[PDB]
Design a protein around this ligand. Sequence first.
Ligand SMILES: [Cu+2]
Length: 123
Amino acid sequence: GPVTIEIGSKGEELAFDKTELTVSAGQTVTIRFKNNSAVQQHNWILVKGGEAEAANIANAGLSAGPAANYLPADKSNIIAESPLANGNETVEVTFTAPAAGTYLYICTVPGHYPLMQGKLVVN
Ligand SMILES: [Cu+2]
C-alpha cells in the first residue's frame, strides 16, 4: 500500500541521511525529502543504470542549471525526480516503484555527486 519514505540531507554534509531504502516493486512511494541545510540546494533523483549513468546525469546537470533541476531533458534513465529543494525546504515526489532490483539515488546539484548517493532496494 502507499507509503511515504522520509529522507533528508545529513545536516550540512553532502550526504543523504539514509543511504538505503527498501520498497516493494509496483508500490506507490512518496519520497518526502527534507533539506536540513539552510545553505545548500539538493535534490533526490532515482536513476536507471550504474554509477557511470549517475555520473553522466550529474555531469549533464552542470550545464543544465537550476531551472532544469540540474538535469537533462532526456529522461530515459531517470525514474523519478524530486523538485529542487532550497535551504530548509521540504519537497516530495510520488512514484510507482520500478521492477525488483537495486537502483541508485543521487543529488545532481553541482559537486554533490559522487558523495551524495544512496541505494533503493526494490523487492
Ligand atoms: Cu545535494
